[PDB]
Amino acid sequence: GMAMEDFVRQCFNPMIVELAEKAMKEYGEDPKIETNKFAAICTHLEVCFMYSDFHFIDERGESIIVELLKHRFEIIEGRDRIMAWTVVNSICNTTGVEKPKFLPDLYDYKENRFIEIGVTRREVHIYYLEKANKKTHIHIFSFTGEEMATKADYTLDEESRARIKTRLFTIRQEMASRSLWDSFRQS
Numbered sequence: 001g002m003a004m005e006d007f008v009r010q011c012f013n014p015m016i017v018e019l020a021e022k023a024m025k026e027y028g029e030d031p032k033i034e035t036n037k038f039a040a041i042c043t044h045l046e047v048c049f050m051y052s053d054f055h056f057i058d059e060r061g062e063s064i065i066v067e068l069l070k071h072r073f074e075i076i077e078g079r080d081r082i083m084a085w086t087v088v089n090s091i092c093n094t095t096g097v098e099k100p101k102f103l104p105d106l107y108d109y110k111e112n113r114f115i116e117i118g119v120t121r122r123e124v125h126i127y128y129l130e131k132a133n134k135k136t137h138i139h140i141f142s143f144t145g146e147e148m149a150t151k152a153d154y155t156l157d158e159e160s161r162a163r164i165k166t167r168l169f170t171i172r173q174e175m176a177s178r179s180l181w182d183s184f185r186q187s
């Protein structure tokens with residue numbers, strides 16, 4: 001468990017890591033005990049913030065990709081649950097979008113929809129099917145470079161996607177090198 005905890009701290013931005021720890025405390029989990037759930041939660045948060053990088057909205061509400069500006073996505077994952085619902089209710093109140101039944105990860109201010117972001121150590125259709133069988137847009141990434149999305153609408157451009165698929169693939173190599181991956185996958 002020490003090796004993974006060390007890996008996590010070296011692998012993710014300290015901000016991500018500080019959020020993961022609070023997230024686990026909320027869930028009643030201890031990051032030093034459930035070190036795998038700790039990596040998973042850091043990975044997921046990272047993909048959420050990556051998904052949002054570089055994306056903005058201009059003065060007419062046109063979306064724009066850019067290497068101070070209105071963010072295109074509200075990031076919902078990461079906040080505590082009551083805070084999270086507060087933001088969600090208010091988006092719905094400002095925009096007439098119907099309230100989702102489960103908390104999503106993001107809200108798209110251009111497309112006006114919530115997004116659920118999945119990251120799976122498994123194969124992606126199996127995951128897609130569990131989550132889908134449960135108007136919130138779904139987008140799934142794998143550690144092995146695959147992805148899939150509700151209606152084949154991947155929202156972002158291709159570069160932003162390859163960026164995330166690459167990061168996930170790298171995280172895997174690095175774990176496998178440190179012989180940490182089998183345990184991560186098997187859980």
Ligand SMILES: O=C(O)/C(O)=C/C(=O)[C@]1(Cc2ccc(Cl)cc2)CCCN(Cc2ccccc2)C1
Nearest residue numbers: 026027040041044077080081103105117118119
């Ligand atoms: O699997 C996901 O892609 C995903 O986004 C899951 C979630 O958002 C929840 C938190 C969580 C996020 C990520 C992981 Cl790997 C595990 C648990 C777990 C299930 C619902 N939960 C709501 C909640 C928030 C705060 C406290 C309690 C419950 C939020």
Ligand SMILES: [Mn+2]
Nearest residue numbers: 077103104105
């Ligand atoms: Mn979430």
Ligand SMILES: [Mn+2]
Nearest residue numbers: 105116117118
């Ligand atoms: Mn998610």
